[PDB]
Amino acid sequence: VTDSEKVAEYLRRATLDLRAARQRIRELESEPIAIIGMACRLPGGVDSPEGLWELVDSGTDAIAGFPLDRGWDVEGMYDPDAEAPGKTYVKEAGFLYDAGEFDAGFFGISPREAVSMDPQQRLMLEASWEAFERAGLDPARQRGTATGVFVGATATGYVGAEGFAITGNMTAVTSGRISYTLGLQGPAVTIDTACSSSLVALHLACQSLRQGECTTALAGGVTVMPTPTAFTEFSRQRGLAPDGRCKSFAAAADGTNWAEGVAVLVVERLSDARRNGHRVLAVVRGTAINQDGASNGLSAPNDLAQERVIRSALDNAGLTASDVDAVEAHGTGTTLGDPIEAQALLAAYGHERPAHRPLRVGSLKSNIGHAGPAAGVAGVIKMVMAMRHGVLPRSLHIDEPTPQVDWSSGAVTLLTEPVDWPDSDRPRRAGVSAFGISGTNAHVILEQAPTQPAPPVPAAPWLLSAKTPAALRAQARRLHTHLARHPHPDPTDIAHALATTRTPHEHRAALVTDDHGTRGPALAALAEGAPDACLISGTALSKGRTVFVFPGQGSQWTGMGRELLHTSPEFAAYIAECETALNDFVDWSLTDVLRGTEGAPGYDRVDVVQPALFAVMVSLARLWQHHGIHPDAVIGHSQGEIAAAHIAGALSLQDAARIVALRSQALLPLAGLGGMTSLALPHDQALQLIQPWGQDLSIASVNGPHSTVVSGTTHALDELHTTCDTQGVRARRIPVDYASHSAQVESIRDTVLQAATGINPQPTTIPLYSTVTGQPIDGTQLDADYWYTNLRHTVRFEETTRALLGSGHRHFIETTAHPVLALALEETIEATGSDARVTGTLRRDHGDLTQLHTALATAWTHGIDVDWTAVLGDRRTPFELPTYAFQRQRYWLEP
Amino acid sequence: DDLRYKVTWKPTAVADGASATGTWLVVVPESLAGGGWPVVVARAVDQAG
C-alpha cells in the first residue's frame, strides 16, 4: 500500500475520535436537560400542572382569607397600624387549606408519626410520587435507582412517638425521606437559599445529571406556614402589601405577600430521556447562579448582578437575548424591587431584538402571591404549560406599567392581556428568574421539547389497582373523567400505559372487551362499584406458588382452538410442533381435526380425543409460559398426567405423543363395554354404596370432598343409577363409552405395556405431583408400569390437591379449553380454610384472543405477575394518565 | 364574654368533585330565561355526566 492511503486512514481515525471527544465535551459542559415530569400543589385549588394552567389562563386570583383550622387567633391578630408586635395589617394571602391533609397509609406511615411530621415532608412526598407517576415512571420500580433529590426548603417551626418527632422536623430529612420512602440512592440535598432555593436546586440537579452522578433527579421546593410569624414580624417595616396582592410591575406596587405551595420536577438528560422513550415536556437549556455581593443593605437587589446572571444563563444555554420570547420575572411586587428587576430585564434582554417582537414579561406571583422557596420552580411549570399551549397568560393587577422604569425602548412589554405565542421559524423559548432575599440570584432558560407505530392488539386489558377499595373506585372515576375529555384515544396505548407505567397495588380490577362501547360504562360501573359483564375485580395475594392443572376427559368442544390458530401465532406454532410430533403414530392431521375440515374424524371417536386434548392442553400451557406465568408445579388427571409430564420435563414431546396416542388406541376394544358416572358424595359413602355390586364397579376418581366418579360395566352402571335415584343423588353420566380406572383395563394390560415401551424418562425440571401416588414423583419413575397403573388405579386428585395446598401453592390454573375441575378444586379449597384461587384459560364457545386476555387479566387480578410486555408490545405512545387517587386525612398538631 | 359568638366564613380546600350520576332537574325563573347563570350551570351538569 502507498504511504498516502496508509496515513489517510490514520487521519480518518484521528478526526473521527476528535469529533467524538468534542461532542463529549459539548455534552459534559452544557447538555440540554429534559423535564420529563412535573407536579405542583399551589393556592387557589391547584393540585396539578393542568390546574395551574387553568388558574393562570382564566386570570383567577388565588388570594383568600387566612386559615381558621390551624389554631390561629385570626380575629385577634389584625390591626391597621404597621408597628405592633404579634399583629399584621394583611387580611388575605395564598394558602394550602389542605396542607395538613395527607395519605399516611399509602407510604406506610402510622398516624402518630404523621401527626408529628412536618407538613413540608408530607407535601413533598405526595408531590414527588405524583411527579414520578406523571413522568411515565412507576415510582415503585425506581427503588434502588441512582436518582437524586434536590429540594428547596426552610425550617418553618412546625412544632410513644418520641423517635418520630426528631426526624419529622429536621429540614435535612425533607429531601432524605423522599429518597428513603421511594428507596432512591442518588444524593439527597436540602437547599436553603430563601426565594431562590428551589430554582438554585434545579441548577444543582442539572450539574448532578451532567457529571453522570444521577440518571434522574427531583428538583423542587416546598413552602408551608404553620404559624403566622411570617405575617406579624415581617409587617413591621411595611414589607407586605396592604390588600395582600402582589402587584408585579404596576404603578400600584406597594409590597408583596407570602403564599404556601409545593412544586417538583422529575428531570433527566435529554439524550437519556429520548433513549428510554419518555415524554419530554420542556428542555432546560442552561442555568446560572451568582450573588448580589456589595449592595445597599443585605436585603436589597442589585441590577448589575441580575444582568450578570441573565447573561451567564444565556451564555450557558448558548442562546441570544433575542432568542428568548418571554420571561417569568420574579416580580415580588415591592416598590423598590420591581424597578430594579425591570431595569435588569431591559438591559439584559431588551437591548438588541426586532421592535415587533418585544420580550413578554409575566409573573406567577400576581396570581398566587410570593410562593416562597417553591416559587421559582413553580414558575417554570407555568412557563412549561403555556409553552405546551402556545398562549402566554396575562399578569393580574396591572393598571399600567410602573413609571419608575422607562419603557421608552419598547423591547420589553408586560403581559397585560393574553398573547398568542408564535410557533414559527424556531422553538418556543422562555426564561424564569428566582432572585432571592439573601442575594443569590438564579436564572433558568427553557426551550420547547423537540418533535419526536404498531398494530392494535385486540381486547387489550385495561388494568386498575389501588391500596384500598375506595381508592380503587376513585381511580376508576378519575380515569373515566380523564378519558371523557379526550378525542377518541387509542385503547391499546391506554392499556399499555396502565399496565407498564403504574404500580400494581393490592386491590386490583380489570376491563377486557373487544369493542370501545362498553369500556366507558364498565368504568362507570366500577366507579359506583356495581358489577359488569366485562369487569373483573379481586385482591392479589402477596405470597403463593402457581400450579398448572391438567384435567383429563370432559373439556372438549367442537372448534376449540380454532380462533387461536389464526389470531395467535405462538399457539399456531405450538400446535404445529405437536402435529409434527404426533404424525408418527396417528393416521390424521391434528390441524384438520381442530379446524374441523371435511373428512377429519370427530371428537366422538375415543382414539382422537385424547391426542387432541393433549396437544391443545400442552399448547395452552406453553402459551401461558410465553406470557411469563411459569408454573411452580404441575398436576394431572388420568391422561392429563401425560401432558403434565411434558410440561414437567419428564417426557419429551415425541415420547408424550407416543404414549397418549398408543394408549388412546389401546382403549378401542373397551368401547361400548362400560362407562363412567359422576356422583356427588364423599369417598366413604360412594365406596360403601357400590358394595352390593361388589367387584363390578370401582371408584374411578375422587375429584373432591363431595364429588366422585365411578366406572364400570353398563349393566352395573344403569343398575346403580336407579339406586341413586331412589337415594336422591345427582349421578351425572359422563359421555364416554369406556370404563377406564376399573377392572376391564386389565384385559388390555399387555397392550398398554407395549404403548409406553421405548420411552426415555428424565428428571423433572418442574415438580410433578402424581395423582396415583399423591405426592411428588421422580421423573425417572414414569415407566410403562406407571402409565398402566395410572390408567388402572383410582385417581386421588383430592388428596393431591390437599398436599399441594399444604406445600404452599395458592394459584391453580386449568390449561384446558373449558374448566372441568374448577368445581372440585374450589370445593377442596373452601373445605380447607385456604385462600387459594382457581382460574381457567378458555370456555365453551369462547376461544378467541378476547377469552385468553380475560383469563390473563383474571390471573393478574388474583396476583400472578403476568408479563404484560408480551401481550401489549414493548413500547407505544406515552399516553398520559391521572395520578394516584390519594385518600388523604387531616394530621395537624394542636396548639 | 363566655356567651359571645360570631358567624364567619371559613375558607376550605376545593373539593375534587365527582360524576353527576343520573338526571338532574334544574328549575329556572322565566324572567331570567336563557341568560347568564342558567345556561352555564346546565352546560356544567351536562359535562358532569
Side-chain angles (χ1 to χ4, degrees), chain A residues 313-328:
Chain A
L314 281 162
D315 194 51
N316 191 357
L319 296 171
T320 69
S322 68
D323 273 308
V324 171
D325 302 335
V327 172
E328 183 69 6

Side-chain angles (χ1 to χ4, degrees), chain A residues 651-749 751-826:
Chain A
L651 301 173
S652 76
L653 188 66
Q654 279 72 15
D655 289 2
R658 197 189 184 282
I659 297 169
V660 66
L662 299 174
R663 181 174 166 182
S664 80
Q665 274 161 9
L667 286 177
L668 278 157
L670 275 293
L673 270 59
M676 281 145 188
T677 287
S678 53
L679 61 83
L681 289 175
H683 195 173
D684 51 25
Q685 284 171 49
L687 193 147
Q688 64 91 359
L689 180 58
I690 55 165
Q691 188 61 258
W693 284 263
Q695 201 260 335
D696 288 314
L697 303 179
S698 298
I699 308 305
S701 68
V702 174
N703 283 20
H706 299 84
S707 174
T708 56
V709 190
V710 295
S711 173
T713 57
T714 311
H715 182 74
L717 208 66
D718 58 4
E719 274 187 296
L720 179 139
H721 206 148
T722 175
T723 302
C724 294
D725 300 327
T726 306
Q727 270 64 79
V729 176
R730 184 52 211 91
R732 215 209 72 251
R733 189 190 198 75
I734 291 154
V736 289
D737 312 325
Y738 77 80
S740 288
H741 311 88
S742 71
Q744 310 187 19
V745 301
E746 267 75 355
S747 176
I748 62 170
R749 180 175 171 287
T751 53
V752 293
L753 266 297
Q754 268 65 77
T757 306
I759 66 189
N760 188 3
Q762 291 108 325
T764 76
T765 48
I766 294 151
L768 182 135
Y769 285 65
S770 159
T771 46
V772 176
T773 71
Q775 62 272 11
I777 197 171
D778 178 51
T780 68
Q781 286 171 2
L782 316 188
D783 64 72
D785 194 282
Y786 171 75
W787 299 118
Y788 165 62
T789 47
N790 181 18
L791 178 53
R792 162 54 171 151
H793 295 328
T794 193
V795 170
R796 290 146 57 189
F797 183 80
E798 194 267 8
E799 170 47 37
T800 317
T801 43
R802 285 185 141 154
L804 266 164
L805 293 164
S807 64
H809 291 89
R810 308 304 216 196
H811 304 269
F812 294 82
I813 292 156
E814 309 202 33
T815 54
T816 65
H818 176 84
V820 285
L821 294 177
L823 273 291
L825 275 154
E826 290 160 310

Side-chain angles (χ1 to χ4, degrees), chain A residues 557-631:
Chain A
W557 47 280
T558 188
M560 74 197 175
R562 195 172 290 168
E563 286 157 326
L564 293 175
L565 282 162
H566 299 163
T567 47
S568 168
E570 291 81 7
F571 185 79
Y574 301 142
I575 286 280
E577 209 170 52
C578 305
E579 164 55 19
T580 49
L582 196 69
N583 275 119
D584 282 20
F585 293 99
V586 169
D587 66 320
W588 41 260
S589 64
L590 177 66
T591 186
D592 284 306
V593 174
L594 297 168
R595 207 193 323 290
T597 53
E598 271 305 356
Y603 294 116
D604 52 19
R605 282 180 63 194
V606 173
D607 61 338
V608 310
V609 71
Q610 284 85 16
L613 281 167
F614 155 81
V616 167
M617 283 173 68
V618 160
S619 47
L620 287 170
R622 281 172 80 199
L623 196 71
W624 271 91
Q625 284 188 290
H626 163 58
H627 293 299
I629 305 94
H630 299 288

Side-chain angles (χ1 to χ4, degrees), chain A residues 245-302:
Chain A
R245 262 71 179 181
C246 290
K247 264 82 71 173
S248 306
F249 305 99
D254 53 352
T256 194
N257 195 3
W258 307 126
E260 318 192 276
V262 69
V264 288
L265 313 167
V266 175
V267 294
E268 178 164 87
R269 296 205 297 158
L270 181 59
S271 67
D272 278 30
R274 198 190 297 281
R275 167 161 41 261
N276 307 127
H278 285 136
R279 193 189 69 277
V280 179
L281 292 158
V283 171
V284 178
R285 266 283 286 279
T287 61
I289 49 166
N290 64 359
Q291 192 77 11
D292 300 344
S295 184
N296 311 124
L298 175 53
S299 49
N302 184 35

Side-chain angles (χ1 to χ4, degrees), chain A residues 59-73:
Chain A
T60 301
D61 194 40
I63 297 285
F66 276 38
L68 273 58
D69 61 346
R70 291 186 187 165
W72 294 5
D73 57 354

Side-chain angles (χ1 to χ4, degrees), chain A residues 44-45 47 64-69 75 97-98 477-478 480-481 528, chain B residues 6 8-14 16-21 47-49:
Chain A
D47 54 353
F66 276 38
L68 273 58
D69 61 346
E75 293 82 3
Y97 303 107
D98 63 78
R477 180 164 63 266
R478 282 183 73 158
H480 182 209
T481 55
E528 292 83 3
Chain B
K6 168 159 76 80
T8 192
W9 292 82
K10 157 166 182 206
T12 188
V14 173
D16 60 349
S19 308
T21 66
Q47 284 101 27

